Design a protein around this ligand. Sequence first.
Ligand SMILES: *Cc1cc2c(cc1C)nc1c(=O)[nH]c(=O)nc-1n2C[C@H](O)[C@H](O)[C@H](O)COP(=O)(O)OP(=O)(O)OC[C@H]1O[C@@H](n2cnc3c(N)ncnc32)[C@H](O)[C@@H]1O
Ligand SMILES: *Cc1cc2c(cc1C)nc1c(=O)[nH]c(=O)nc-1n2C[C@H](O)[C@H](O)[C@H](O)COP(=O)(O)OP(=O)(O)OC[C@H]1O[C@@H](n2cnc3c(N)ncnc32)[C@H](O)[C@@H]1O
Lengths: 573, 573, 104, 52
Amino acid sequence: KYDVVIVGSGPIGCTYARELVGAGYKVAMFDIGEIDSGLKIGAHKKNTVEYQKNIDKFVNVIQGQLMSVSVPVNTLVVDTLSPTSWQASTFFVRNGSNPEQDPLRNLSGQAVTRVVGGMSTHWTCATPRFDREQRPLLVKDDADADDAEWDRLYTKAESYFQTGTDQFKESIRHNLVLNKLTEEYKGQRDFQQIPLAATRRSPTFVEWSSANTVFDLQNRPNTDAPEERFNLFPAVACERVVRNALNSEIESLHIHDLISGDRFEIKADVYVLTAGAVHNTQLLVNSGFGQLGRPNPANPPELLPSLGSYITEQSLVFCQTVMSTELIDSVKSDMTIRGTPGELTYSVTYTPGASTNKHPDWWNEKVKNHMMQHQEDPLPIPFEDPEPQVTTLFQPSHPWHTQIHRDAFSYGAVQQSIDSRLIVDWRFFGRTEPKEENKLWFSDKITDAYNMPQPTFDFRFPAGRTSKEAEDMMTDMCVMSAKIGGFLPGSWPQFMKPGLVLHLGGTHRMGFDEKEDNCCVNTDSRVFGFKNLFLGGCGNIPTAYGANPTLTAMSLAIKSCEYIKQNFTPSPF
Amino acid sequence: KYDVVIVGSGPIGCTYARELVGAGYKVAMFDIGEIDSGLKIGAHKKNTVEYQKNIDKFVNVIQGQLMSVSVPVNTLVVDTLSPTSWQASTFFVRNGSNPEQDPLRNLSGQAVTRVVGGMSTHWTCATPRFDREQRPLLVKDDADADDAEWDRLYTKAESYFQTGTDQFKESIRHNLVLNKLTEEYKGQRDFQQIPLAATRRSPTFVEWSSANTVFDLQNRPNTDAPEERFNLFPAVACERVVRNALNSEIESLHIHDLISGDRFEIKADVYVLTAGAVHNTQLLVNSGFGQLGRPNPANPPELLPSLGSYITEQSLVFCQTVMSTELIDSVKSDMTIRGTPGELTYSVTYTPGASTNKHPDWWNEKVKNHMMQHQEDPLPIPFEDPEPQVTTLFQPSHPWHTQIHRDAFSYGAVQQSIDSRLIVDWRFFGRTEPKEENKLWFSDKITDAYNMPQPTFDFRFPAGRTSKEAEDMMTDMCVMSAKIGGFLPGSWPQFMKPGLVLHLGGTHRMGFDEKEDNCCVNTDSRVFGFKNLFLGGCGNIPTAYGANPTLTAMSLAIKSCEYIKQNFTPSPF
Amino acid sequence: VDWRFFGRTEPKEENKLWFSDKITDAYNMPQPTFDFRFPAGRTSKEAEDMMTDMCVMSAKIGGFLPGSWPQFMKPGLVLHLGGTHRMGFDEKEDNCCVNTDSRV
Amino acid sequence: NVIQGQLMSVSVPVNTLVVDTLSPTSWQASTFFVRNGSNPEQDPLRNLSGQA
Ligand SMILES: *Cc1cc2c(cc1C)nc1c(=O)[nH]c(=O)nc-1n2C[C@H](O)[C@H](O)[C@H](O)COP(=O)(O)OP(=O)(O)OC[C@H]1O[C@@H](n2cnc3c(N)ncnc32)[C@H](O)[C@@H]1O
Ligand SMILES: *Cc1cc2c(cc1C)nc1c(=O)[nH]c(=O)nc-1n2C[C@H](O)[C@H](O)[C@H](O)COP(=O)(O)OP(=O)(O)OC[C@H]1O[C@@H](n2cnc3c(N)ncnc32)[C@H](O)[C@@H]1O
């Protein structure tokens, strides 16, 4: 018996834990995944010296914990086999494919992570706020009151994640890119550093935030928190919540310990589901919400008929660029260079503090010393200079999120020929209109690897504004990126596979009125009709958004926990 | 001050810890890497439910912790850049390349892992013994005595790693492949299961051994070992051992804590280096053994002139096959099949226990039930049937090691069209003659990512028998694999990049006499001349070997620890 | 639909086609060798403006075909090499090889 | 195919790509020598590589 049980140990489940453990509730948390980020439980995997030394190897870490949600049956012909090799006469269901999945209505890049800390053990840590256009309402008919509520929630979410905009302020590359863009879009768009959930520890080490930053996941009471109560139970599959008859309360949570094989029911006052946008939906379906099997509006579900409908995923366009000659030469614009590099006469000098210099002294010292000490190196940028982290945030005249940066990436052998200091990544994210016909549903015949109902998508990007804006966004990336450099071969402007972005929203969406707003939870993230059932995560977000959603989802989790504190009493310790 | 200090927390360093902590020595162990395998410190990363469900994702784990030792300067031309993009006029030293490295004398696949548990957190766990031809001598001029010593050491090493040959005995695929090969090579070669360091826990879960199996790496004393003494210090770079003047003793170990930045000297009675074949050599060079800079026999080193010479790496050939029609049909040879699958009349039956059946009842029940219950599936092999794990061990008439199995592999989209149950991997490993001219040396100008002397190879596969045998081995794989099926397109028989095998040996090689056997350590793994310095690992192996070397290296570590117990007294507790 | 946009290249003295005095081609004639880079300044800026223009214009018709994303082609693949024996009015003042009758 | 079959490259630089998955029995040079019709006068970084 617990006061509060939380399904899922990602950053949203950890927000509930931080708030509710700190308030004195006796809290249990279950995760189907295991502890495997080191002794700091749920911490960011990128915070080892070895990954900080070799960022690009990190793409392997990410890929190794992303499992595809729904893979269609493969129909590719292989006809260069030996005649002795056994072959079927049809393209049969094999290799883990979902036979319910129409390949032409899929989110083929959608994937899930089952580990303690969830996806926050590998995420990019970008934590922008949503502007009004992207953001669900918390106060109706009073925009100033609505803004005030969001500001308070986002401010607390930013403190939990240690969001900052200063960790890259003395990078030459960052400031090179940022300066050019600020100048090019003067009077039209504003640029800043991407808000990142991270703390710089040294000039070459950044401690990336994670679920662990929000809540350390250590069992309590302990010497450090002797009056708190928390237990974490990894390798436990939460299967089903038991509804009462009137669908007004949850009575227990059915769990399956994957190590012992034992199956139990756990009792709690408050049940919080934070298993992610796919797996929250799965657990609800398995508990008798919505409908199992292929959707059939002939007869909509009685319980939460909007569950799994109005799903949204962002469009994502990508390229990389190789920095222009104009910009590289500008790095060293304040220098007087004489002689020929490597020969007796070579020198590089500048006049500190001169009013006509284009750069600050900190920049010019770094450049000068790099050029003088490394004459074998033809670039003016220090070897260990951090990467750009630049954005122009979503606005009505440019309704997409932008990241102009470097993230872990697997470079091919041709691309490895280009010096890394030249390369900048461009990721532009579009907003997707929520449409009733875009669904996540669960098979009544096929099961997934954990023997739960197999998720299946029926998705297409909506016609109309979403689609038009996706193309305007592609064009905008092409236009903007040209100010910095030309494209890197092999990383020409392209759309990525749908869902590869991992910002799936709207699967258990929020609104004011269940019927009128076609939604599953109210603004306290409480499931309609249920006194003690709360859902957290991006699945709650009912709007068309382009920015990265986790901070927003954390903010809605905070509000949800304020409701729980107003309505449920902790047990005596 | 410690009785014993161990540099490196892989399985060889853990062998020293297990032996010496258990004998009552006060032991410290340092690893440059971090704890990141979960709460069981140094455990196998593949032992999560999630990897057991999705083996192929594990290749990402491996790749994410393999860092290339020496990468030459890239000279590939990219000429489809935009004219605005900055480009150098030469192929300059960039992107981490080693300018000392001749691309045509490299081991381009050689890589290192810096993590607590070392490479044993991702290894394949194959632990064969070496036969006399491959194995260094421990007793001169008495082959029976020599065999007896190796048998005792291997038996203890097998118990430490939990080596077994029974974990795949009821797999249909394993027995299908094994049976065919046993029959095809009757009277010529013997086949068995690959000896694997692993314990089966259920029909779908195998607990793969690791450094943690050998020693749990927990600090001691603790409730469970209240009279033992052990401390593990991760994120500590060991830089140098301090020699006395006479080169008869080590006086201290210089360390650098990578988190605090502090640099200390640690005192011990016994110093053991188990940092791997590359990094042991690096640490010795940094400590004044051998020679820094490009080798120059004009003046050989005074101290350990054979260090870093006579290096050996195995040749490795690879393919995959798609199982033959003959073999797939043989699975169901005992069945009477009537009707058409999916139709009312379909049935599959057999006669249990009949003397004319080709398979045991356990096999036929599995097949029959699979065929009847899954009529949409055209194959007779159960979905969760384990993979083959088959070998014919090195012999003078086939002087290569063989693994005929499945390991984690990244399948392309065409290859994903072939049902996984059809696919078998073939890895054949050749032996490489030790030659003086094959060297690992360390730059006196360029440093690696941890600011230690940059490793550089001067390697080519020797002419003569090694090379001839590499081709005979390629032919043998082609011949043998054809008995099982034809090649899988994209996985046609091929040599892999040199060093990708990761069985680098001979860098600090063992023998009886330093001069006459051109070696660095004696048969107690004691560095010649030094009373208290021991090296462990594959670097000790002085022979041409084809089998996987870790069990052999563990065996030599055991012998080394028996010497330490005979010669050094533990401190009072 | 295919989109091919072709830019103009400023003639620069330093961009040369020359012929080896040591190496011969397949017909045993002096081997052609280039010393070429796209000029700095307007040519190069316009090449990027042109890339942008193709991206903008093409979006009015449809999205890109995977595998045929906007890209520069290898230099010279266009086969519109000019200026190797160039025309002008005055040999010296116009740095040229033939007059307006194409007479050397 | 018709086009490609009658376009002959004007000036091809010396190839320096490393192939290191050959068999140990196969003959290999220790340098990237002038071969396969390459023009040793041609700096790969000042070429018109598509000219034909
Ligand atoms: C993968 C990734 C994600 C990502 C990112 C880059 C990549 C490569 N970049 C981001 C960024 O720059 N900014 C941002 O806002 N988000 C970014 N993301 C996405 C972000 O990681 C996710 O939005 C976030 O982690 C979602 O948090 P939430 O806590 O809701 O969910 P989760 O992390 O997926 O964790 C859920 C857990 O629940 C478990 N689980 C699942 N099913 C069950 C059942 N049945 N029973 C018990 N536990 C369950 C999982 O194992 C998991 O840990
Ligand atoms: C990677 C791998 C290896 C492998 C394998 C498959 C792959 C993909 N398959 C194997 C198999 O089937 N059978 C077998 O016998 N071996 C197989 N291997 C190789 C095996 O993992 C290695 O032979 C073995 O792990 C070697 O053990 P050893 O203990 O000698 O070395 P290590 O595991 O590399 O660990 C050494 C550690 O030392 C640290 N270190 C390095 N430098 C320093 C310094 N300067 N200071 C402090 N510590 C240092 C490392 O961080 C490391 O953990």
